[PDB]
Amino acid sequence: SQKNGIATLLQAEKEAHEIVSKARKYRQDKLKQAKTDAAKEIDSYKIQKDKE
Amino acid sequence: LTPNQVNDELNKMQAFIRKEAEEKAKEIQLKADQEYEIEKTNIVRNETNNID
Amino acid sequence: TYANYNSAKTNLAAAERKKTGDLSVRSLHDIVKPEDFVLNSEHLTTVLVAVPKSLKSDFEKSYETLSKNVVPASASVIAEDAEYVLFNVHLFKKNVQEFTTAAREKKFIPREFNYSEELIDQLKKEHDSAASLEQSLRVQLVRLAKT
């Protein structure tokens, strides 16, 4: 009836929205990793040059 | 025939849409991975050159 | 002024024309149930297929014997004009055109429409404007012609 054509369908919409939200979270955390890893590597290079 | 055809069809393609969601999420996360790699490598190279 | 009056009269004629005819554009705004018209997501698109009264049996077994996932218990008429009927048929989000082509091979007249309040407001306001403007222009022209 209305229930299996509306409520379950909206829940499937919620599943899809959850999947895309998780994709966004992957993107965001990956970009923050791209920044933080570079930040840590530049210091490693800087100290290596400075010590010598 | 019995209307079980109806449930068969709806469940089949509601699973097809979910696999579509899964594959698009896979593509998105992978592409984010390569973008992460590229940005990190570019920044580290750029700063290391100046340090040297 | 008389040209404007005749323009208003033909506007009234146009407005009254749509009150009679089949269902390809026939209005379903106050006798339409949005609950029988699922819109939240692209999973079951309730197409509005209309047929004359002749093909009752030929249509009633066109969804529940050949179609795919037409939501059961809802494929019937919302309002009948003694000559044509309607049906709240559903189908996929990726194979609408194929089923539409099959129906038009069966020679049905689909009704594609968006449930919007502004449309009903436009209907009411154009009705009122045409009628009132025509009447007031008539009487103002009475004074003007007398003068």
Curated annotation (Swiss-Prot), chain B:
<feature type="region of interest" description="Interaction with VMA10">
    <location>
        <begin position="12"/>
        <end position="31"/>
    </location>
</feature>
<comment type="function">
    <text>Subunit of the V1 complex of vacuolar(H+)-ATPase (V-ATPase), a multisubunit enzyme composed of a peripheral complex (V1) that hydrolyzes ATP and a membrane integral complex (V0) that translocates protons. V-ATPase is responsible for acidifying and maintaining the pH of intracellular compartments.</text>
</comment>
<comment type="similarity">
    <text>Belongs to the V-ATPase E subunit family.</text>
</comment>
<comment type="subunit">
    <text>Homodimer. V-ATPase is a heteromultimeric enzyme composed of a peripheral catalytic V1 complex (components A to H) attached to an integral membrane V0 proton pore complex (components: a, c, c', c'', d, e, f and VOA1). Interacts with VMA5; the interaction is direct. Interacts with VMA10; the interaction is direct. Interacts with RAV1 and RAV2 components of the RAVE complex, which are essential for the stability and assembly of V-ATPase.</text>
</comment>
<protein>
    <recommendedName>
        <fullName>V-type proton ATPase subunit E</fullName>
    </recommendedName>
</protein>
<feature type="coiled-coil region">
    <location>
        <begin position="8"/>
        <end position="38"/>
    </location>
</feature>
<feature type="region of interest" description="Interaction with VMA5">
    <location>
        <begin position="1"/>
        <end position="13"/>
    </location>
</feature>
Swiss-Prot record, chain C:
<comment type="function">
    <text>Subunit of the V1 complex of vacuolar(H+)-ATPase (V-ATPase), a multisubunit enzyme composed of a peripheral complex (V1) that hydrolyzes ATP and a membrane integral complex (V0) that translocates protons. V-ATPase is responsible for acidifying and maintaining the pH of intracellular compartments. Subunit C is necessary for the assembly of the catalytic sector of the enzyme and is likely to have a specific function in its catalytic activity. Reversibly leaves the enzyme after glucose depletion, causing the catalytic subcomplex V1 to detach from the V0 section.</text>
</comment>
<comment type="subunit">
    <text>V-ATPase is a heteromultimeric enzyme composed of a peripheral catalytic V1 complex (components A to H) attached to an integral membrane V0 proton pore complex (components: a, c, c', c'', d, e, f and VOA1). Interacts directly with VMA4.</text>
</comment>
<protein>
    <recommendedName>
        <fullName>V-type proton ATPase subunit C</fullName>
    </recommendedName>
</protein>
<comment type="similarity">
    <text>Belongs to the V-ATPase C subunit family.</text>
</comment>
